[PDB]
Paper text:
The S-layer Deinoxanthin-binding complex (SDBC), one of the main units of the characteristic multilayered cell envelope of this bacterium, protects against environmental stressors and allows exchanges with the environment. The crystalline cell envelope/S-layer of D. radiodurans is made by three different multisubunit protein complexes among which the main one is the S-layer Deinoxanthin-binding complex (SDBC), composed of the xanthophyll-binding protein DR_2577 (SlpA) and at least five more accessory subunits. The SDBC appeared to be composed of three main regions: (i) a massive β-barrel organization structuring the pores' region, (ii) a β-sandwich organization characterizing the collar region, and (iii) a trimeric coiled coil for the stalk region. The SDBC is shown to be both a photoprotective system, through the xanthophyll-binding subunit DR_2577, and a chemoprotective one, by the SOD activity of the subunit DR_0644.
The collar region of the SDBC was solved by cryo-EM at ∼2.5 Å resolution and found to consist of a single protein complex organized as a trimer. The protein sequence was modeled assigning 120 residues, missing a central threonine-rich region between the residues 90 and 137, which could be either disordered or truncated with respect to its ORF. Two short and disordered parts of the sequence, flanking the cleaved region upstream (residues 80–89) and downstream (residues 138–141), as well as a small N-terminal region interacting with the xanthophyll carotenoid deinoxanthin, remained unassigned (Leu6-Ala19). The DR_0644 presents a typical β-sandwich motif, with six opposing antiparallel β-sheets, creating a structure with a width of ∼34 Å and a length of ∼85 Å. The three monomers assemble into a trimer via a linking region of 17 residues at the N-terminal side (Gly20 – Pro36). The Cu-binding site involves three characteristic His residues (His74, His76, and His182), indicating DR_0644 to be a Cu-only SOD, a group of soluble enzymes typical for the periplasm and extracellular compartments and here unusually found to be part of a cell envelope complex, the SDBC. Coordination and distances for the assigned binding site supported the presence of Cu2+. The lower resolution of the collar allowed to identify and assign the Cu-binding domain but not to localize the densities for the Cu ions, which were predicted with high confidence by different bioinformatic means. The characteristic active site with the three coordinated histidines structurally confirmed the Cu-only SOD identity of this protein, corroborating the function of the collar region.
Numbering used by the authors:
A (entry chain B), B (entry chain A), C (entry chain C): 20 to 79, 142 to 201
The structure:
């Protein structure tokens, strides 16, 4: 009846990756008011659906972390992770760099130890 | 009970993965009826439970996908996926190749840029 | 006075992991009573969350496995699997090495072919 066809298939050699691209970039916002500090670290070009726990690591430059500034949120679908969080300025004292890490779950935890970071 | 036993473990010398072997093969079969085209493509040796989006790409190898010819399916558990579809023969009048890609999700974008391809 | 500072973050360079180190190690306690054998393989330093099928491979290394001894279990969040199994002694007669493997499914399956093995 209708014209048929039955081609055999052939593997391609350069099966290049597609989809979004891993290039950690970002801009932080350390807005400070009366005695609390809201911080909006907007990151882009991150990992499609990953967790990005970010806090304030004190001077130590692997040092201790004021864990009372943990912000946990997930990375959208193109790596558009937007972290936010309030912390009394008194706790913040002696913090030197806001380190962004990957997470193992929305319950904090540490997977990667410093994917992106900035002084203050 | 009356007899015990205690043995410390040793991690062998080399551990080898088993199950399916990623050997992409294929079998395209077109049957163009009255202003319509059915396409049953059988891919064996694929990735155990992956998505396999398939389209008819125009000339320009390289060139634009006729998006109205998408066929999507999963590869069972040994890497056997079967792609079926139905498209008017007027839209695929300039198709030069049927490119099979991997999928990111059920009905969605590509994760690769062509794993296996047959020339038409 | 909303003291606000905007800082661009650097893409880092040191991204070493943070969690269970895959270092397979453990012991075995095969205990015979009145014609039955109870085997307890407590492992540590394993994959954090993975099914670990373990059975008795006979002599022959390759060799068949008396599959009437498959001990299945999953690991915790540090990598601690506790395999436990009841097998008639007459069955495990002529067994040579208890081979632990990886489980593709809770139904069993040998993803890996021996991540750790103990001579019995």
């Amino acid at each position: 009846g209708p014209t048929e066809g039955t081609y055999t298939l052939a593997p391609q050699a350069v099966v290049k990756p597609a989809g979004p691209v891993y290039a950690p970039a970002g801009t932080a916002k350390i807005s400070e008011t009366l005695g609390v500090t809201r911080t909006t670290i907007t990151l882009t070009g991150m990992a499609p659906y990953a967790i990005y726990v970010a806090h304030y690591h004190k001077m130590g430059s692997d040092g201790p972390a004021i864990m009372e500034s943990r912000m946990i949120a997930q990375a959208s679908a193109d790596g558009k992770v937007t972290l936010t969080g309030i912390v009394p300025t008194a706790l913040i004292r002696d913090a030197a760099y806001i380190n962004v890490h990957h997470g193992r779950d929305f319950s904090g935890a540490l997977a990667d130890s410093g994917v992106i970071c900035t002084p203050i």
